[PDB]
């Protein structure tokens, strides 16, 4: 607490902590709406995840 | 429900080789597929065992057990989505055209997951793959879903 560690986590969590790289995003989650998420990821590495 | 489809009972008389109106437990997987149901073989296996039914020892059947097992498999037909079948094979080969190289689909269908014999794999590629060694899976999955 006194370190700043817990305060850096706070400030993080306000922002957007976890940030996924797009391919790293495709592969792992395509399966969720498999048809429409796979198409997206393949069709545009980025546009896909979108 | 009947909609009472009495043609399921008439098809049981076409698969029972003894004519006694019983169908062995080893035929129930293939006859659920012939009535318009595609349960995976592990699912057919589980359900069986789930009910303390051993497919290892002699089996008989009665229509009164085969009817409710077909009705328990009939809810799982919502898993048959063709978007995921064509997108599976679209992730299996590069470039923007739906072609699997011959031996890639034959070795994957025989050795990956539920083992399909290479005799059945050759009977499913016969006609859709020409001598270029490239299977167009847009028409291949269309013809596989025509039966």
mmCIF file with all atom_site columns, C-alpha atoms in Angstrom:
data_model
loop_
_atom_site.group_PDB
_atom_site.id
_atom_site.type_symbol
_atom_site.label_atom_id
_atom_site.label_alt_id
_atom_site.label_comp_id
_atom_site.label_asym_id
_atom_site.label_entity_id
_atom_site.label_seq_id
_atom_site.pdbx_PDB_ins_code
_atom_site.Cartn_x
_atom_site.Cartn_y
_atom_site.Cartn_z
_atom_site.occupancy
_atom_site.B_iso_or_equiv
_atom_site.pdbx_formal_charge
_atom_site.auth_seq_id
_atom_site.auth_comp_id
_atom_site.auth_asym_id
_atom_site.auth_atom_id
_atom_site.pdbx_PDB_model_num
ATOM 1   C CA . UNK A 1 1   ? 0.000   0.000   0.000   1.00 0.00 ? 1   UNK A CA 1
ATOM 2   C CA . UNK A 1 2   ? 2.799   2.227   1.034   1.00 0.00 ? 2   UNK A CA 1
ATOM 3   C CA . UNK A 1 3   ? 4.835   1.064   -1.919  1.00 0.00 ? 3   UNK A CA 1
ATOM 4   C CA . UNK A 1 4   ? 2.677   2.458   -4.610  1.00 0.00 ? 4   UNK A CA 1
ATOM 5   C CA . UNK A 1 5   ? 2.063   -1.007  -6.010  1.00 0.00 ? 5   UNK A CA 1
ATOM 6   C CA . UNK A 1 6   ? -1.489  -1.091  -4.860  1.00 0.00 ? 6   UNK A CA 1
ATOM 7   C CA . UNK A 1 7   ? -2.051  2.365   -6.163  1.00 0.00 ? 7   UNK A CA 1
ATOM 8   C CA . UNK A 1 8   ? -0.671  1.485   -9.537  1.00 0.00 ? 8   UNK A CA 1
ATOM 9   C CA . UNK A 1 9   ? -3.086  -1.370  -9.719  1.00 0.00 ? 9   UNK A CA 1
ATOM 10  C CA . UNK A 1 10  ? -5.940  0.961   -8.834  1.00 0.00 ? 10  UNK A CA 1
ATOM 11  C CA . UNK A 1 11  ? -5.131  3.460   -11.511 1.00 0.00 ? 11  UNK A CA 1
ATOM 12  C CA . UNK A 1 12  ? -4.802  0.562   -13.856 1.00 0.00 ? 12  UNK A CA 1
ATOM 13  C CA . UNK A 1 13  ? -8.181  -0.809  -13.068 1.00 0.00 ? 13  UNK A CA 1
ATOM 14  C CA . UNK A 1 14  ? -9.805  2.474   -13.844 1.00 0.00 ? 14  UNK A CA 1
ATOM 15  C CA . UNK A 1 15  ? -8.072  2.282   -16.980 1.00 0.00 ? 15  UNK A CA 1
ATOM 16  C CA . UNK A 1 16  ? -8.140  -0.725  -19.208 1.00 0.00 ? 16  UNK A CA 1
ATOM 17  C CA . UNK A 1 17  ? -5.854  -3.269  -17.558 1.00 0.00 ? 17  UNK A CA 1
ATOM 18  C CA . UNK A 1 18  ? -5.754  -6.367  -19.751 1.00 0.00 ? 18  UNK A CA 1
ATOM 19  C CA . UNK A 1 19  ? -5.002  -5.649  -23.382 1.00 0.00 ? 19  UNK A CA 1
ATOM 20  C CA . UNK A 1 20  ? -5.221  -8.359  -25.982 1.00 0.00 ? 20  UNK A CA 1
ATOM 21  C CA . UNK A 1 21  ? -3.277  -8.488  -29.140 1.00 0.00 ? 21  UNK A CA 1
ATOM 22  C CA . UNK A 1 22  ? -5.562  -9.264  -32.029 1.00 0.00 ? 22  UNK A CA 1
ATOM 23  C CA . UNK A 1 23  ? -4.276  -12.654 -33.306 1.00 0.00 ? 23  UNK A CA 1
ATOM 24  C CA . UNK A 1 24  ? -3.727  -13.697 -29.743 1.00 0.00 ? 24  UNK A CA 1
ATOM 25  C CA . UNK A 1 25  ? -7.370  -12.717 -29.567 1.00 0.00 ? 25  UNK A CA 1
ATOM 26  C CA . UNK A 1 26  ? -8.567  -14.610 -32.580 1.00 0.00 ? 26  UNK A CA 1
ATOM 27  C CA . UNK A 1 27  ? -7.110  -18.008 -31.890 1.00 0.00 ? 27  UNK A CA 1
ATOM 28  C CA . UNK A 1 28  ? -8.148  -18.233 -28.249 1.00 0.00 ? 28  UNK A CA 1
ATOM 29  C CA . UNK A 1 29  ? -11.716 -17.077 -28.727 1.00 0.00 ? 29  UNK A CA 1
ATOM 30  C CA . UNK A 1 30  ? -12.803 -17.746 -32.338 1.00 0.00 ? 30  UNK A CA 1
ATOM 31  C CA . UNK A 1 31  ? -14.726 -20.695 -30.914 1.00 0.00 ? 31  UNK A CA 1
ATOM 32  C CA . UNK A 1 32  ? -17.203 -18.417 -29.088 1.00 0.00 ? 32  UNK A CA 1
ATOM 33  C CA . UNK A 1 33  ? -19.334 -17.560 -32.171 1.00 0.00 ? 33  UNK A CA 1
ATOM 34  C CA . UNK A 1 34  ? -17.130 -19.717 -34.028 1.00 0.00 ? 34  UNK A CA 1
ATOM 35  C CA . UNK A 1 35  ? -18.509 -19.000 -37.478 1.00 0.00 ? 35  UNK A CA 1
ATOM 36  C CA . UNK A 1 36  ? -18.683 -15.200 -37.184 1.00 0.00 ? 36  UNK A CA 1
ATOM 37  C CA . UNK A 1 37  ? -15.634 -14.678 -34.958 1.00 0.00 ? 37  UNK A CA 1
ATOM 38  C CA . UNK A 1 38  ? -13.413 -16.950 -37.124 1.00 0.00 ? 38  UNK A CA 1
ATOM 39  C CA . UNK A 1 39  ? -14.472 -15.145 -40.274 1.00 0.00 ? 39  UNK A CA 1
ATOM 40  C CA . UNK A 1 40  ? -13.692 -11.814 -38.624 1.00 0.00 ? 40  UNK A CA 1
ATOM 41  C CA . UNK A 1 41  ? -10.238 -12.894 -37.391 1.00 0.00 ? 41  UNK A CA 1
ATOM 42  C CA . UNK A 1 42  ? -9.229  -14.484 -40.685 1.00 0.00 ? 42  UNK A CA 1
ATOM 43  C CA . UNK A 1 43  ? -10.739 -11.782 -42.894 1.00 0.00 ? 43  UNK A CA 1
ATOM 44  C CA . UNK A 1 44  ? -8.945  -9.013  -41.097 1.00 0.00 ? 44  UNK A CA 1
ATOM 45  C CA . UNK A 1 45  ? -6.460  -9.840  -38.388 1.00 0.00 ? 45  UNK A CA 1
ATOM 46  C CA . UNK A 1 46  ? -7.850  -6.872  -36.532 1.00 0.00 ? 46  UNK A CA 1
ATOM 47  C CA . UNK A 1 47  ? -11.264 -6.302  -38.177 1.00 0.00 ? 47  UNK A CA 1
ATOM 48  C CA . UNK A 1 48  ? -11.906 -9.900  -37.128 1.00 0.00 ? 48  UNK A CA 1
ATOM 49  C CA . UNK A 1 49  ? -11.725 -9.451  -33.347 1.00 0.00 ? 49  UNK A CA 1
ATOM 50  C CA . UNK A 1 50  ? -13.919 -6.523  -34.073 1.00 0.00 ? 50  UNK A CA 1
ATOM 51  C CA . UNK B 2 1   ? -44.774 -37.361 -30.804 1.00 0.00 ? 1   UNK B CA 1
ATOM 52  C CA . UNK B 2 2   ? -46.402 -38.854 -33.818 1.00 0.00 ? 2   UNK B CA 1
ATOM 53  C CA . UNK B 2 3   ? -46.416 -35.949 -35.229 1.00 0.00 ? 3   UNK B CA 1
ATOM 54  C CA . UNK B 2 4   ? -46.303 -39.714 -34.705 1.00 0.00 ? 4   UNK B CA 1
ATOM 55  C CA . UNK B 2 5   ? -43.675 -40.863 -37.193 1.00 0.00 ? 5   UNK B CA 1
ATOM 56  C CA . UNK B 2 6   ? -44.427 -44.569 -37.563 1.00 0.00 ? 6   UNK B CA 1
ATOM 57  C CA . UNK B 2 7   ? -41.776 -44.833 -40.282 1.00 0.00 ? 7   UNK B CA 1
ATOM 58  C CA . UNK B 2 8   ? -39.132 -45.058 -37.534 1.00 0.00 ? 8   UNK B CA 1
ATOM 59  C CA . UNK B 2 9   ? -40.692 -48.390 -36.574 1.00 0.00 ? 9   UNK B CA 1
ATOM 60  C CA . UNK B 2 10  ? -40.766 -49.469 -40.210 1.00 0.00 ? 10  UNK B CA 1
ATOM 61  C CA . UNK B 2 11  ? -37.072 -48.623 -40.515 1.00 0.00 ? 11  UNK B CA 1
ATOM 62  C CA . UNK B 2 12  ? -36.368 -50.737 -37.430 1.00 0.00 ? 12  UNK B CA 1
ATOM 63  C CA . UNK B 2 13  ? -37.806 -53.683 -39.347 1.00 0.00 ? 13  UNK B CA 1
ATOM 64  C CA . UNK B 2 14  ? -35.326 -52.964 -42.152 1.00 0.00 ? 14  UNK B CA 1
ATOM 65  C CA . UNK B 2 15  ? -32.326 -53.014 -39.804 1.00 0.00 ? 15  UNK B CA 1
ATOM 66  C CA . UNK B 2 16  ? -33.285 -56.056 -37.743 1.00 0.00 ? 16  UNK B CA 1
ATOM 67  C CA . UNK B 2 17  ? -31.773 -59.039 -39.546 1.00 0.00 ? 17  UNK B CA 1
ATOM 68  C CA . UNK B 2 18  ? -33.616 -61.646 -37.442 1.00 0.00 ? 18  UNK B CA 1
ATOM 69  C CA . UNK B 2 19  ? -37.141 -60.240 -37.858 1.00 0.00 ? 19  UNK B CA 1
ATOM 70  C CA . UNK B 2 20  ? -37.899 -60.520 -34.077 1.00 0.00 ? 20  UNK B CA 1
ATOM 71  C CA . UNK B 2 21  ? -38.364 -56.711 -33.742 1.00 0.00 ? 21  UNK B CA 1
ATOM 72  C CA . UNK B 2 22  ? -35.201 -56.145 -31.698 1.00 0.00 ? 22  UNK B CA 1
ATOM 73  C CA . UNK B 2 23  ? -32.093 -54.215 -32.708 1.00 0.00 ? 23  UNK B CA 1
ATOM 74  C CA . UNK B 2 24  ? -28.735 -54.796 -31.012 1.00 0.00 ? 24  UNK B CA 1
ATOM 75  C CA . UNK B 2 25  ? -27.069 -51.945 -29.141 1.00 0.00 ? 25  UNK B CA 1
ATOM 76  C CA . UNK B 2 26  ? -24.214 -51.827 -31.663 1.00 0.00 ? 26  UNK B CA 1
ATOM 77  C CA . UNK B 2 27  ? -26.639 -50.903 -34.453 1.00 0.00 ? 27  UNK B CA 1
ATOM 78  C CA . UNK B 2 28  ? -28.303 -48.065 -32.537 1.00 0.00 ? 28  UNK B CA 1
ATOM 79  C CA . UNK B 2 29  ? -25.576 -45.542 -33.381 1.00 0.00 ? 29  UNK B CA 1
ATOM 80  C CA . UNK B 2 30  ? -25.894 -46.060 -37.133 1.00 0.00 ? 30  UNK B CA 1
ATOM 81  C CA . UNK B 2 31  ? -29.690 -46.261 -37.062 1.00 0.00 ? 31  UNK B CA 1
ATOM 82  C CA . UNK B 2 32  ? -29.991 -42.949 -35.227 1.00 0.00 ? 32  UNK B CA 1
ATOM 83  C CA . UNK B 2 33  ? -27.950 -41.509 -38.068 1.00 0.00 ? 33  UNK B CA 1
ATOM 84  C CA . UNK B 2 34  ? -30.232 -43.186 -40.619 1.00 0.00 ? 34  UNK B CA 1
ATOM 85  C CA . UNK B 2 35  ? -33.307 -41.636 -38.961 1.00 0.00 ? 35  UNK B CA 1
ATOM 86  C CA . UNK B 2 36  ? -31.870 -38.133 -39.356 1.00 0.00 ? 36  UNK B CA 1
ATOM 87  C CA . UNK B 2 37  ? -29.781 -37.698 -36.211 1.00 0.00 ? 37  UNK B CA 1
ATOM 88  C CA . UNK B 2 38  ? -26.039 -37.150 -35.913 1.00 0.00 ? 38  UNK B CA 1
ATOM 89  C CA . UNK B 2 39  ? -24.914 -37.956 -32.344 1.00 0.00 ? 39  UNK B CA 1
ATOM 90  C CA . UNK B 2 40  ? -21.150 -38.335 -32.030 1.00 0.00 ? 40  UNK B CA 1
ATOM 91  C CA . UNK B 2 41  ? -19.917 -41.853 -31.253 1.00 0.00 ? 41  UNK B CA 1
ATOM 92  C CA . UNK B 2 42  ? -18.619 -40.821 -27.813 1.00 0.00 ? 42  UNK B CA 1
ATOM 93  C CA . UNK B 2 43  ? -22.061 -39.450 -27.019 1.00 0.00 ? 43  UNK B CA 1
ATOM 94  C CA . UNK B 2 44  ? -23.717 -42.682 -28.099 1.00 0.00 ? 44  UNK B CA 1
ATOM 95  C CA . UNK B 2 45  ? -21.128 -44.485 -25.989 1.00 0.00 ? 45  UNK B CA 1
ATOM 96  C CA . UNK B 2 46  ? -21.625 -42.321 -22.892 1.00 0.00 ? 46  UNK B CA 1
ATOM 97  C CA . UNK B 2 47  ? -25.371 -42.392 -22.861 1.00 0.00 ? 47  UNK B CA 1
ATOM 98  C CA . UNK B 2 48  ? -25.210 -46.191 -23.098 1.00 0.00 ? 48  UNK B CA 1
ATOM 99  C CA . UNK B 2 49  ? -22.772 -46.551 -20.178 1.00 0.00 ? 49  UNK B CA 1
ATOM 100 C CA . UNK B 2 50  ? -24.507 -43.714 -18.359 1.00 0.00 ? 50  UNK B CA 1
ATOM 101 C CA . UNK B 2 51  ? -27.513 -46.080 -18.211 1.00 0.00 ? 51  UNK B CA 1
ATOM 102 C CA . UNK B 2 52  ? -25.298 -49.038 -16.978 1.00 0.00 ? 52  UNK B CA 1
ATOM 103 C CA . UNK B 2 53  ? -25.671 -50.548 -20.465 1.00 0.00 ? 53  UNK B CA 1
ATOM 104 C CA . UNK B 2 54  ? -22.675 -52.559 -21.682 1.00 0.00 ? 54  UNK B CA 1
ATOM 105 C CA . UNK B 2 55  ? -22.086 -52.650 -25.443 1.00 0.00 ? 55  UNK B CA 1
ATOM 106 C CA . UNK B 2 56  ? -19.314 -55.200 -24.767 1.00 0.00 ? 56  UNK B CA 1
ATOM 107 C CA . UNK B 2 57  ? -21.656 -58.126 -24.068 1.00 0.00 ? 57  UNK B CA 1
ATOM 108 C CA . UNK B 2 58  ? -24.504 -59.463 -26.206 1.00 0.00 ? 58  UNK B CA 1
ATOM 109 C CA . UNK B 2 59  ? -27.403 -57.036 -26.604 1.00 0.00 ? 59  UNK B CA 1
ATOM 110 C CA . UNK B 2 60  ? -30.931 -57.099 -27.888 1.00 0.00 ? 60  UNK B CA 1
ATOM 111 C CA . UNK B 2 61  ? -33.409 -54.482 -28.230 1.00 0.00 ? 61  UNK B CA 1
ATOM 112 C CA . UNK B 2 62  ? -36.772 -53.509 -28.066 1.00 0.00 ? 62  UNK B CA 1
ATOM 113 C CA . UNK B 2 63  ? -38.456 -50.706 -29.736 1.00 0.00 ? 63  UNK B CA 1
ATOM 114 C CA . UNK B 2 64  ? -39.498 -49.358 -26.300 1.00 0.00 ? 64  UNK B CA 1
ATOM 115 C CA . UNK B 2 65  ? -35.905 -48.427 -25.472 1.00 0.00 ? 65  UNK B CA 1
ATOM 116 C CA . UNK B 2 66  ? -34.807 -47.394 -28.945 1.00 0.00 ? 66  UNK B CA 1
ATOM 117 C CA . UNK B 2 67  ? -37.641 -44.893 -29.351 1.00 0.00 ? 67  UNK B CA 1
ATOM 118 C CA . UNK B 2 68  ? -36.747 -42.853 -26.182 1.00 0.00 ? 68  UNK B CA 1
ATOM 119 C CA . UNK B 2 69  ? -33.007 -43.031 -27.021 1.00 0.00 ? 69  UNK B CA 1
ATOM 120 C CA . UNK B 2 70  ? -33.728 -41.499 -30.428 1.00 0.00 ? 70  UNK B CA 1
ATOM 121 C CA . UNK B 2 71  ? -35.834 -38.850 -28.708 1.00 0.00 ? 71  UNK B CA 1
ATOM 122 C CA . UNK B 2 72  ? -33.001 -38.066 -26.293 1.00 0.00 ? 72  UNK B CA 1
ATOM 123 C CA . UNK B 2 73  ? -30.598 -37.711 -29.216 1.00 0.00 ? 73  UNK B CA 1
ATOM 124 C CA . UNK B 2 74  ? -33.014 -35.494 -31.163 1.00 0.00 ? 74  UNK B CA 1
ATOM 125 C CA . UNK B 2 75  ? -32.445 -32.448 -28.947 1.00 0.00 ? 75  UNK B CA 1
ATOM 126 C CA . UNK B 2 76  ? -28.768 -32.425 -29.865 1.00 0.00 ? 76  UNK B CA 1
ATOM 127 C CA . UNK B 2 77  ? -29.465 -31.674 -33.546 1.00 0.00 ? 77  UNK B CA 1
ATOM 128 C CA . UNK B 2 78  ? -29.087 -27.949 -32.732 1.00 0.00 ? 78  UNK B CA 1
ATOM 129 C CA . UNK B 2 79  ? -25.312 -28.573 -32.737 1.00 0.00 ? 79  UNK B CA 1
ATOM 130 C CA . UNK B 2 80  ? -25.306 -29.106 -36.542 1.00 0.00 ? 80  UNK B CA 1
ATOM 131 C CA . UNK B 2 81  ? -24.335 -25.622 -37.762 1.00 0.00 ? 81  UNK B CA 1
ATOM 132 C CA . UNK B 2 82  ? -22.862 -25.411 -41.255 1.00 0.00 ? 82  UNK B CA 1
ATOM 133 C CA . UNK B 2 83  ? -21.120 -22.087 -40.609 1.00 0.00 ? 83  UNK B CA 1
ATOM 134 C CA . UNK B 2 84  ? -18.659 -23.791 -38.318 1.00 0.00 ? 84  UNK B CA 1
ATOM 135 C CA . UNK B 2 85  ? -18.124 -26.724 -40.672 1.00 0.00 ? 85  UNK B CA 1
ATOM 136 C CA . UNK B 2 86  ? -17.087 -24.544 -43.593 1.00 0.00 ? 86  UNK B CA 1
ATOM 137 C CA . UNK B 2 87  ? -15.075 -22.199 -41.366 1.00 0.00 ? 87  UNK B CA 1
ATOM 138 C CA . UNK B 2 88  ? -13.214 -25.171 -39.873 1.00 0.00 ? 88  UNK B CA 1
ATOM 139 C CA . UNK B 2 89  ? -11.959 -26.190 -43.301 1.00 0.00 ? 89  UNK B CA 1
ATOM 140 C CA . UNK B 2 90  ? -11.375 -22.544 -44.277 1.00 0.00 ? 90  UNK B CA 1
ATOM 141 C CA . UNK B 2 91  ? -8.865  -22.279 -41.426 1.00 0.00 ? 91  UNK B CA 1
ATOM 142 C CA . UNK B 2 92  ? -7.291  -25.558 -42.567 1.00 0.00 ? 92  UNK B CA 1
ATOM 143 C CA . UNK B 2 93  ? -5.875  -24.220 -45.857 1.00 0.00 ? 93  UNK B CA 1
ATOM 144 C CA . UNK B 2 94  ? -4.270  -20.931 -46.960 1.00 0.00 ? 94  UNK B CA 1
ATOM 145 C CA . UNK B 2 95  ? -5.452  -18.482 -49.660 1.00 0.00 ? 95  UNK B CA 1
ATOM 146 C CA . UNK B 2 96  ? -8.956  -17.273 -50.514 1.00 0.00 ? 96  UNK B CA 1
ATOM 147 C CA . UNK B 2 97  ? -10.395 -20.403 -52.124 1.00 0.00 ? 97  UNK B CA 1
ATOM 148 C CA . UNK B 2 98  ? -11.873 -23.466 -50.454 1.00 0.00 ? 98  UNK B CA 1
ATOM 149 C CA . UNK B 2 99  ? -9.471  -26.313 -51.308 1.00 0.00 ? 99  UNK B CA 1
ATOM 150 C CA . UNK B 2 100 ? -7.937  -28.936 -49.029 1.00 0.00 ? 100 UNK B CA 1
ATOM 151 C CA . UNK B 2 101 ? -5.043  -30.951 -50.422 1.00 0.00 ? 101 UNK B CA 1
ATOM 152 C CA . UNK B 2 102 ? -6.296  -34.559 -50.771 1.00 0.00 ? 102 UNK B CA 1
ATOM 153 C CA . UNK B 2 103 ? -4.102  -36.310 -48.202 1.00 0.00 ? 103 UNK B CA 1
ATOM 154 C CA . UNK B 2 104 ? -4.580  -33.597 -45.564 1.00 0.00 ? 104 UNK B CA 1
ATOM 155 C CA . UNK B 2 105 ? -8.287  -34.273 -45.256 1.00 0.00 ? 105 UNK B CA 1
ATOM 156 C CA . UNK B 2 106 ? -7.869  -38.029 -45.571 1.00 0.00 ? 106 UNK B CA 1
ATOM 157 C CA . UNK B 2 107 ? -5.321  -38.336 -42.770 1.00 0.00 ? 107 UNK B CA 1
ATOM 158 C CA . UNK B 2 108 ? -7.186  -35.900 -40.523 1.00 0.00 ? 108 UNK B CA 1
ATOM 159 C CA . UNK B 2 109 ? -10.495 -37.729 -40.940 1.00 0.00 ? 109 UNK B CA 1
ATOM 160 C CA . UNK B 2 110 ? -8.914  -41.090 -40.152 1.00 0.00 ? 110 UNK B CA 1
ATOM 161 C CA . UNK B 2 111 ? -6.627  -40.175 -37.243 1.00 0.00 ? 111 UNK B CA 1
ATOM 162 C CA . UNK B 2 112 ? -7.994  -37.062 -35.522 1.00 0.00 ? 112 UNK B CA 1
ATOM 163 C CA . UNK B 2 113 ? -10.593 -37.662 -32.840 1.00 0.00 ? 113 UNK B CA 1
ATOM 164 C CA . UNK B 2 114 ? -13.223 -40.221 -33.766 1.00 0.00 ? 114 UNK B CA 1
ATOM 165 C CA . UNK B 2 115 ? -11.358 -42.555 -36.114 1.00 0.00 ? 115 UNK B CA 1
ATOM 166 C CA . UNK B 2 116 ? -13.007 -42.910 -39.505 1.00 0.00 ? 116 UNK B CA 1
ATOM 167 C CA . UNK B 2 117 ? -11.740 -45.845 -41.545 1.00 0.00 ? 117 UNK B CA 1
ATOM 168 C CA . UNK B 2 118 ? -9.796  -45.007 -44.682 1.00 0.00 ? 118 UNK B CA 1
ATOM 169 C CA . UNK B 2 119 ? -12.400 -46.976 -46.643 1.00 0.00 ? 119 UNK B CA 1
ATOM 170 C CA . UNK B 2 120 ? -15.089 -44.535 -45.461 1.00 0.00 ? 120 UNK B CA 1
ATOM 171 C CA . UNK B 2 121 ? -12.785 -41.569 -46.076 1.00 0.00 ? 121 UNK B CA 1
ATOM 172 C CA . UNK B 2 122 ? -12.284 -42.646 -49.696 1.00 0.00 ? 122 UNK B CA 1
ATOM 173 C CA . UNK B 2 123 ? -16.041 -43.093 -50.121 1.00 0.00 ? 123 UNK B CA 1
ATOM 174 C CA . UNK B 2 124 ? -16.622 -39.527 -48.890 1.00 0.00 ? 124 UNK B CA 1
ATOM 175 C CA . UNK B 2 125 ? -14.052 -37.927 -51.229 1.00 0.00 ? 125 UNK B CA 1
ATOM 176 C CA . UNK B 2 126 ? -14.947 -39.984 -54.302 1.00 0.00 ? 126 UNK B CA 1
ATOM 177 C CA . UNK B 2 127 ? -16.319 -37.560 -56.878 1.00 0.00 ? 127 UNK B CA 1
ATOM 178 C CA . UNK B 2 128 ? -15.689 -34.253 -55.091 1.00 0.00 ? 128 UNK B CA 1
ATOM 179 C CA . UNK B 2 129 ? -11.919 -34.454 -55.395 1.00 0.00 ? 129 UNK B CA 1
ATOM 180 C CA . UNK B 2 130 ? -10.572 -34.522 -58.942 1.00 0.00 ? 130 UNK B CA 1
ATOM 181 C CA . UNK B 2 131 ? -7.036  -35.394 -60.158 1.00 0.00 ? 131 UNK B CA 1
ATOM 182 C CA . UNK B 2 132 ? -5.575  -31.992 -59.172 1.00 0.00 ? 132 UNK B CA 1
ATOM 183 C CA . UNK B 2 133 ? -5.429  -33.247 -55.564 1.00 0.00 ? 133 UNK B CA 1
ATOM 184 C CA . UNK B 2 134 ? -7.579  -30.349 -54.354 1.00 0.00 ? 134 UNK B CA 1
ATOM 185 C CA . UNK B 2 135 ? -10.893 -30.889 -52.620 1.00 0.00 ? 135 UNK B CA 1
ATOM 186 C CA . UNK B 2 136 ? -13.279 -27.963 -52.916 1.00 0.00 ? 136 UNK B CA 1
ATOM 187 C CA . UNK B 2 137 ? -14.973 -28.018 -49.521 1.00 0.00 ? 137 UNK B CA 1
ATOM 188 C CA . UNK B 2 138 ? -17.632 -25.486 -50.471 1.00 0.00 ? 138 UNK B CA 1
ATOM 189 C CA . UNK B 2 139 ? -19.239 -28.113 -52.678 1.00 0.00 ? 139 UNK B CA 1
ATOM 190 C CA . UNK B 2 140 ? -17.876 -30.962 -50.548 1.00 0.00 ? 140 UNK B CA 1
ATOM 191 C CA . UNK B 2 141 ? -19.660 -29.851 -47.366 1.00 0.00 ? 141 UNK B CA 1
ATOM 192 C CA . UNK B 2 142 ? -22.729 -29.015 -49.428 1.00 0.00 ? 142 UNK B CA 1
ATOM 193 C CA . UNK B 2 143 ? -22.923 -32.604 -50.697 1.00 0.00 ? 143 UNK B CA 1
ATOM 194 C CA . UNK B 2 144 ? -22.155 -34.038 -47.252 1.00 0.00 ? 144 UNK B CA 1
ATOM 195 C CA . UNK B 2 145 ? -25.153 -32.124 -45.895 1.00 0.00 ? 145 UNK B CA 1
ATOM 196 C CA . UNK B 2 146 ? -27.319 -33.322 -48.797 1.00 0.00 ? 146 UNK B CA 1
ATOM 197 C CA . UNK B 2 147 ? -27.716 -36.731 -47.159 1.00 0.00 ? 147 UNK B CA 1
#
